[PDB]
Ligand binder design. Structure first.
Ligand code: HEM
Ligand SMILES: O=C(O)c1cccnc1
Length: 153
């Protein structure tokens, strides 16, 4: 698909749609995560000692937001330039992931949780062309973070 002008127009549009609702889209995102893999709960400080996912914990929102931003930013950068650029941020990310005990078999957990989250986010507008555009952008970004964890470990 590549990322035509037409495809990127499609990712931007659908990211703007996600930020419009951060406490929802982020809490859904942690439930789609514990649905896919329950044990992950122990990993997150603010999830431990809890029994359910807190819905209004600022630490949790700030946390999940920052994840989706990072996937959008990557798509535009592929359309315009043709690649995903690796900066300071991307590498610190790879350290923290390893402290916290996180592995690669974890990544399809968080991808399916984010395609399912954006399918949920764009509803009927959804196209094959669009799913193909976010799929392309997540896979291209995770290829990069995995790459730095393996370096932070
Ligand atoms: C493209 C994919 C991914 C992106 C963009 C991403 C991004 C981030 C960021 C931005 C932080 C620190 C947030 C803070 O300072 O506020 C972080 C922390 C962390 N990450 Fe991810 N991540 C990805 C995949 C994963 C996966 C697959 C897992 C495993 C389930 C995971 C588990 C964690 C844990 C346990 C922490 C520490 C949270 C704490 O207790 O403070 N991440 N990540
Ligand atoms: O909240 C976090 O810190 C988080 C969530 C998903 C993936 N990575 C980090």
């Amino acid at each position: 698909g590549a990322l035509t002008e037409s495809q990127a127009a499609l990712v931007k549009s659908s990211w703007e749609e996600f930020n419009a609702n951060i406490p929802k889209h982020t809490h859904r995102f942690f439930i789609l995560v514990l649905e896919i893999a329950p044990a992950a709960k122990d990993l997150f400080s603010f999830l431990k000692g809890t029994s359910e996912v807190p819905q209004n914990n600022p630490e949790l929102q700030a946390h999940a937001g920052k994840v989706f931003k990072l996937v959008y930013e990557a798509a535009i950068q592929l359309e315009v330039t043709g690649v995903v650029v690796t900066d300071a941020t991307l590498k610190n990310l790879g350290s923290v992931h390893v402290s916290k005990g996180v592995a690669d078999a974890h990544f399809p957990v968080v991808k399916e949780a984010i395609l399912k989250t954006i399918k949920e986010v764009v509803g009927a507008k959804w196209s094959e062309e669009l799913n193909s555009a976010w799929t392309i952008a997540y896979d291209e970004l995770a290829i990069v973070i995995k790459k730095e964890m393996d370096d932070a470990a």
